[PDB]
């Protein structure tokens, strides 16, 4: 008889999260999705569930869709395709049993917020993936292979604004002006080469990236050299600040 536990083989993620082992590092106001793949030596998994603790690890049972709120009307969902359970060959290396995760986190959810959930799969004999350890109690995500975490990060951690090299910042005054206006910050700012394109909208309706001059910035510049600070505010309200040089010369 089968006395071998099903085995979590692989996790994949897409969109607004980064995977570190069993932890999903999620940037606010961005959709993400994930898959977790399991195999069993029998080739068949009978039950699969997501639960908030490890207490019911050993009890074979199935969940459909479970979720939790993440502020700003947003949520994370954990989904089992239950109609694929309890079929021969549904959990082989070439056809792993796959559960999905999808959602997003609202801007009002604090940075470093952390949720723990547990995913269990069961073969027909009732052997289960993972174990009964409470990773909160032992302060160690890795102590239970069934544990997964969702950790909230600021969009400012993901993005790196840079200066658009093609836009002129060396100005010459006209014949009869003491100043020249630098105008809008947005014309000078882009994403650093090889880093993610800056967001436009968030998930919360009405959220969007802004490009402004830092409070206290004078924008009508007289002759000389200047350094101005531009503020990129992401949809989640976190910010990068980038210093931008300008030169103002008199007309000959
Ligand atoms: Ca088995
Ligand atoms: Ca940044």
Residue numbers in the entry: 125 to 376
Question: Can you provide the manuscript's text about this entry?
Answer:
The long-wavelength beamline I23 at Diamond Light Source overcomes these limitations and extends the accessible wavelength range to λ = 5.9 Å. In this study, we report the determination of diverse protein structures by experimental phasing techniques carried out at long wavelengths on beamline I23 at Diamond Light Source using S, Ca, K, Cl, V, I, Cd, and P as anomalous scatterers. Native-SAD uses light atoms naturally occurring in proteins or bound to proteins.
Calcium is used less often because its K-edge is located at a longer wavelength (λ = 3.07 Å), typically not accessible at standard MX beamlines. A domain of the accessory Sec-dependent serine-rich glycoprotein adhesin from Streptococcus oralis (Fap1) was solved by Ca-SAD on beamline I23 from two calcium ions and 1080° of data to a resolution of 2 Å. Compared to sulfur, the calcium anomalous signal is stronger and more efficient for phasing.
